[PDB]
Structure 1
Amino acid sequence: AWKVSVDQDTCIGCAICASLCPDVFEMNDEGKAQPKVEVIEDEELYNCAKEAMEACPVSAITIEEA
């Protein structure tokens, strides 16, 4: 399984990740992104999250596997 994280101090709230992968990322009350799910097992969701991670203009996204 995978766990996605968005570094709140780094995120600039550009919403690219939410646009690309709305099942995985949402905007919060600070105007930053955060994961809308605490675990991913669905390969489609992981693949999307991986593309968002690669696209983030400020490198705020990381994905942990276990």
Structure 2
Amino acid sequence: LTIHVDQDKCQGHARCKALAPELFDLDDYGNAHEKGDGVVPADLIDKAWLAKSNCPENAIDITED
């Protein structure tokens, strides 16, 4: 599992960042992006799917391999 935020879809709700601070960083304009790895650790797999479910703009993709 990896995370991606589509920059064109992001409108900076910051829900992703409130749910999974560990997985997203916000730029100075409030837009989110995947952090370091992008790879989702075993303990954050659920917060990942939640952040994606919760984004109002459907801006988050999770890849599965």
How would you bin the TM-score normalised by the shorter chain?
0.7 to 0.9
CA contact (8 A) 2:23 2:38 kept: no
Structure 2 gap ranges (5+): none
Structure-2-length-normalised TM-score: 0.88
Aligned position for 1:32 = 31
Aligned position for 1:15 = 14
The alignment of Structure 1 onto Structure 2 pairs a total of residues equal to: 64
Moved >4 Å (runs of 4+): none
Structure-1-length-normalised TM-score: 0.86
Q: Percent identity?
A: 39
Equivalent-residue separation in structure 2 for 1:21 and 1:7 (angstroms): 17
Equivalent-residue separation in structure 2 for 1:34 and 1:7 (angstroms): 8
Deviations 1:3-59 (A, max 9, x none): 10001000001111000100001102442101113212x222121011000010010
Structure 1 gap ranges (5+): none
